[PDB]
Write a protein that binds this ligand. Structure first.
Ligand SMILES: Cc1cc2nc3c(=O)[nH]c(=O)nc-3n(C[C@H](O)[C@H](O)[C@H](O)COP(=O)(O)O)c2cc1C
Length: 138
């Protein structure tokens, strides 16, 4: 499986690692890829797309790298299963509610409730691992 993410301070990156840990514990392999090193062609062969990005700007996806990536794959993911996650700060998840609506609008099936964690996953570490285990059971 593959997990693609963007992280500005490491919060979402740590979530990605924990999610991968859950998938591995369930007995499956998975690679974590920073959005800047993703190969869209290889990624589209995946059964499930696991995507993560922290809340940036005014409750939007990161603009210089992550958003263009989503825009690029948007026309080629109809029917694909997706799992969404990310870290946020002072808001209450607006960027994620919009991210989920967007992916659904592209025809994707959002498999689980998106996982959002405030700042660094501290107390939420097991939650991240469990999210990975849920995706591995798909
Ligand atoms: C420029 C900027 C804008 C942000 N905008 C938001 C926002 O609209 N709402 C929010 O909840 N957090 C916002 N945050 C806080 C980040 O989402 C939060 O610090 C998160 O933990 C960062 O995760 P990362 O290290 O994976 O990027 C913003 C952070 C930065 C640097």
């Amino acid at each position: 499986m593959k997990i693609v993410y963007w992280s500005g301070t490491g919060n979402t990156e740590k979530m990605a690692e924990l999610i991968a840990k859950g998938i591995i514990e369930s007995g499956k392999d998975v690679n974590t890829i920073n959005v800047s090193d993703v190969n869209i062609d290889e990624l589209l062969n995946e059964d499930i797309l696991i995507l993560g990005c922290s809340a940036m700007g005014d409750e939007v996806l990161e603009e210089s790298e992550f958003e263009p990536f989503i825009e690029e794959i948007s026309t080629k993911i109809s029917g694909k299963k997706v799992a969404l996650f990310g870290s946020y700060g002072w808001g209450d998840g607006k960027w994620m509610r919009d991210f989920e609506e967007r992916m659904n609008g592209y025809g994707c099936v959002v498999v689980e409730t998106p996982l959002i964690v405030q700042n660094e996953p501290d107390e939420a570490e097991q939650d991240c691992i469990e999210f990975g285990k849920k995706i591995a059971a798909i």
